[PDB]
Amino acid sequence: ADFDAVLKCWGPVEADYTTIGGLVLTRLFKEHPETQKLFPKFAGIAQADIAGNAAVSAHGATVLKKLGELLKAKGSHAAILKPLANSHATKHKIPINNFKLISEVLVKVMQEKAGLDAGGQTALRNVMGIIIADLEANYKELGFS
Ligand code: HEM
């Protein structure tokens, strides 16, 4: 049910993954500046110059597309989340807490831009908790606690 609750508000996100993806990453870097170092292509870009940056928005679109694809799966997601854990632990080297941060940002963006109400905000935090716990369990399998 919590996946359905989020998907009933995903339309505005999927409608413009570039704009919303750019909003999410811009906000992440503004509110959690230490995360920007984790993107070597973007690390060091002055904050005022991120909202207008097409490459930032394009990567935000990649992130949100994958998250959509996953949702739409409604928890039967292994062929999906295992590769993502693998690349994020071993290639991008993203500590697991950062996924909690981007999920806090996405809740806010969806509240403001996608009509996500109080119950939907809870549903999204629950679904992101499912995703993050699975990423964490796969990180552990790889040696990353
Ligand atoms: C559930 C949330 C997230 C999803 C769905 C997601 C998804 C993706 C996808 C699909 C890619 C490209 C291909 C692949 O790895 O398989 C990617 C790359 C990347 N992601 Fe994530 N990501 C998330 C969260 C994060 C966070 C929290 C960070 C850091 C704070 C991060 C940093 C990166 C970096 C650095 C790359 C490589 C960019 C490049 O080389 O161009 N991601 N992500």
Token digits of residue 64:
């949100």
Which residues fall within 8 angstroms of residue 50, CB to CB, at 6 or more apart?
Answer: 25, 26, 29, 30, 42, 56
User: Residue 111 belongs to a domain with what CATH number?
Assistant: 1.10.490.10
Q: Which atom of ligand 1 lies at the shortest distance from residue 102's CA?
A: 27
The total number of structural domains that make up the chain: 1
Reported resolution in A?
0.9
Helix (H, G, I), strand (E, B) or coil at 74: coil
Site residues for ligand 1, CB cut-off 6 Å: 35, 38-39, 41, 59, 62-63, 66-67, 83-84, 87-88, 92, 94, 98-99, 102, 131
**Ligand 1 centroid from CA 88, angstroms:** 7
**Whether the Cβ atoms of residue 57 and residue 25 lie closer than 8 Å to each other:** yes
Please give the Cα distance from 111 to 120 (Å, whole number): 9
User: Residue 94 is part of which domain span?
Assistant: 1-145
